[PDB]
Amino acid sequence: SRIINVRLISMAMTGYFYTFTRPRTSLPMSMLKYDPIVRRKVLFLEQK
Amino acid sequence: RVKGTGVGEKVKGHKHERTLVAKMEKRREAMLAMPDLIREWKKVGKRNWTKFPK
Amino acid sequence: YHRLNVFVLEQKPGAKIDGEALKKHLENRENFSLKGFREKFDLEPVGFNLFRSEWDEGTAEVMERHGIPGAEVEFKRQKFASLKPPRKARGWEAKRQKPKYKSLWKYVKRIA
Amino acid sequence: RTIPKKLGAKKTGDQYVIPGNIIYKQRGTLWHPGENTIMGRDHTIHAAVAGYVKYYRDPQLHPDRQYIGVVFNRNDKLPYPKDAPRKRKLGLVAVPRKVEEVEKPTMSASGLPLFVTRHETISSVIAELIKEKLAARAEYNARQSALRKLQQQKMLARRGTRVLRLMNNYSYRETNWEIGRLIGDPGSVPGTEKVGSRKAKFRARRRRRNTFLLGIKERKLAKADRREEYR
Amino acid sequence: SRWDIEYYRDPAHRGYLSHQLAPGESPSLYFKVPTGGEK
RNA sequence: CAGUCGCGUAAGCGGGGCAUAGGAUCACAAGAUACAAAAAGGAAAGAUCUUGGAUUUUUGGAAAAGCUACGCUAGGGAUAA
RNA sequence: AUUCUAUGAUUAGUGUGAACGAAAAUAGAGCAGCCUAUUAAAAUAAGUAAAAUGGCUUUAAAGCUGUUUGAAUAUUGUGGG
Ligand SMILES: [K+]
Ligand SMILES: [K+]
Ligand SMILES: [Mg+2]
Ligand SMILES: [Mg+2]
Ligand SMILES: [Mg+2]
Ligand SMILES: [Mg+2]
Ligand SMILES: [Mg+2]
Ligand SMILES: [Mg+2]
Ligand SMILES: [Mg+2]
Ligand SMILES: [Mg+2]
Ligand SMILES: [Mg+2]
Ligand SMILES: [Mg+2]
Give the chain A residue nearest B28 (alpha carbons).
A12
**E37: helix, coil or strand?**
strand
Residues with Cβ within 8 Å of residue A10, at least 6 apart in sequence: A16, A17, A33, A35, A37, A42, A43, A44
Q: How far is the CA of D221 from the CAs of A45, D226, D231, in angstroms?
A: 57, 9, 15
B vs E: CB pairs below 8 A: 12
Which nucleotides of chain G are near protein (any atom < 7 Å from a CB)? 10-11, 18
Phi, psi of B25 (to 5 degrees): -70, -40
- On chain B, the residues whose CB falls within 8 A of the CB of D174 are 24, 28
Residues with Cβ within 8 Å of residue E34, at least 6 apart in sequence: D116, D118, D164, D172
* Chains A and C share 3 or more Cβ pairs within 8 Å: no
Q: Is the CB of D4 under 7 A from strand F?
A: no
Nearest to D18 among C73, C76, C80 (CB): C80
Nearest to D176 among A32, A38, A41 (CB): A38
C-alpha span between D10 and D23 (Å, rounded): 5
Residues with Cβ within 8 Å of residue C75, at least 6 apart in sequence: D92, D93, D94, D95
The answer to whether D48 and D88 are in contact (CB under 8 A) is no
The answer to whether D169 and B16 are in contact (CB under 8 A) is no
- On chain C, the residues whose CB falls within 8 A of the CB of D51 are none
The helix (H) or strand (E) run that includes residue B44 is: helix B34-44
**B31: helix, coil or strand?**
helix
Give the chain B residue nearest A13 (alpha carbons).
B27
C-alpha span between D116 and D106 (Å, rounded): 10
Nearest to D189 among A37, A39, A41 (CB): A41
Selection from D29, D28, D36 nearest residue D69 by Cα: D36
C-alpha span between D44 and D115 (Å, rounded): 52
For residue D170, the number of C-alpha atoms closer than 13 Å in the C-beta half-sphere is 22
**D25: helix, coil or strand?**
strand
Q: How far is the CA of D176 from the C1' of G48 (A)?
A: 61
User: Cβ–Cβ contacts within 10 Å for residue D173, how many?
Assistant: 15
Q: Which method resolved this structure?
A: cryo-EM
C-alpha span between D69 and D79 (Å, rounded): 9
3-state helix, strand, coil in chain C (%, to 5): 30, 20, 50
- On chain B, the residues whose CB falls within 8 A of the CB of A12 are 27, 30-31, 34
The answer to whether C52 and C6 are in contact (CB under 8 A) is no
Phi, psi of C99 (to 5 degrees): -60, -15
Selection from C85, C86, C105 nearest residue C95 by Cα: C105
B32–D191 C-beta distance less than 8 A: no
The helix (H) or strand (E) run that includes residue B23 is: helix B21-32
Running DSSP on this structure, what letter comes out for residue C39?
A: H
C80 touches chain D (CB under 8 A): yes
Selection from A14, A15, A42, A12 nearest residue A30 by Cα: A42
Please, is D48 exposed, middle or buried when counting C-beta atoms within 10 Å of its C-beta (0-12, 13-18, 19+)? middle
Region of B22 (left: φ > 0; alpha: ψ -120 to 50; beta: rest) is alpha
